[PDB]
């Protein structure tokens, strides 16, 4: 699922809740900044709530968090 | 939050020496091996423009003679060779924490050989005249160091009040300075004298230069 | 091509509102985020806040908080920003820059820039004067004249010699003010060869005033 | 209460290649 239509860049936007698909990985959440280190053999990670705590970008190398959005 | 400083305020550094410029951070941006910090180049009467991204990498047209790198909360900025289109203000930035802060700025300046002042003097324009004013204005062009003394004689008799002095920032090619001095004076008080002085204190130069016109 | 461009200057009264425009052009306007940059001559560069014309949500400082406005207007594409009883001590240049996002984010774009001062003087329209020695005998072989400008409100003013026609030689001093007034002067060097058998002209353009005045030397 | 996105980020890997 790595070509789909124009959206192959769709430049990041960071601090803001969205809904977001990484490498064919739904999800929701805030995009902040991480201090985590990874190892870079390895693609993401998860929690122990089987959810996935950090993205890593395809292109750029970098590690990013997935925080949760406010709900009630 | 995190706050940035920067030291020293100001730098003079001269041709094909190195300048370095440190910004300090309050607590460590540095994050998945990488930091954040970002530097910046403004001139007088342009807005900021981007220098290097993340401190590793140099944007794309901006000269190879700018560099730098660092680690923690201590970076520096290097330059090298120095050119004269090189004088601004540069700034550091951290996107790492919310809300995000600037730095607070240094003053380059460029050191070079002396040069004699340019004294020319103006007398007031008849057009002013008719309004029932005058004002003597007398330019100075292409001296350094920016510290310089102007002084004012009226028929012999000098006057240090009423005296509009202004100066401005290096230039990017000729790199040397320039100002100006206006004297305001009424229509009654211009009849009553002849001469105007336009003088002024270099250090090179040993006897000051006295330009003056007869009305 | 992505441009921003701002208006020039905006004067405004104590107690009342201002208002600033910052027109997007060449990429989608409710994608990323707008900023707003206060710098005050001699604070060096202070943060105002960010906007997402989306939803319309800010982050503000809170030293800004309660203060500044910020709001959007999505069909123009322009991003807007109002200050809460503009004072002696608000006047200052306001940036508009995108913030770009690749990792880290920087600041790839920037305004034209918009002065904001805070007075309680009227538009006045300026006055421009020839400046010349009147003759020489051997002096140099070069020609310099100059060009006083002063009883104008506000600052600041285009001052170019010929319509920008000489790109050398040009230098433009800082205002004064005195008497609720500014007053600046500028100086032009030509060859010898030039101003005997060519005239040049002091062009002075005030856009707050709506006015241009042109004189000959 | 959930608060919703306004907006969708999809990013794919760069292509080396593709296959025929």
Known sequence: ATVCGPKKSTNLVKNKCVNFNFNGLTGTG??????????????????????????????????????????? | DIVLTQSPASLAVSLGQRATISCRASKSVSASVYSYMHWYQQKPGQPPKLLIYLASSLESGVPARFSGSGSGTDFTLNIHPVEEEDAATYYCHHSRELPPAFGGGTKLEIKRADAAPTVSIFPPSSEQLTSGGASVVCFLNNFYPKDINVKWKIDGSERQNGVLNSWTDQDSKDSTYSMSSTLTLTKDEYERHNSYTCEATHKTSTSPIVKSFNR | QVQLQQPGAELVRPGASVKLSCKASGYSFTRFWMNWVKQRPGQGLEWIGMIHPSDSETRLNQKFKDKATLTVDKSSTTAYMQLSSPTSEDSAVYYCARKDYDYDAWFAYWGQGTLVTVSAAKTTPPSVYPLAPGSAAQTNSMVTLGCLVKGYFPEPVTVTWNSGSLSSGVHTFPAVLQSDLYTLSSSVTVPSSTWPSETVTCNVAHPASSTKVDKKI
């Open chain 1, 30 to 72: 805030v995009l902040t900044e991480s201090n985590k280190k990874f190892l870079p053999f390895q693609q993401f990670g998860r929690d122990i709530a089987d959810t996935t705590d950090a993205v890593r970008d395809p292109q750029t190398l970098e590690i990013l968090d997935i925080t949760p959005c406010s709900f009630g």
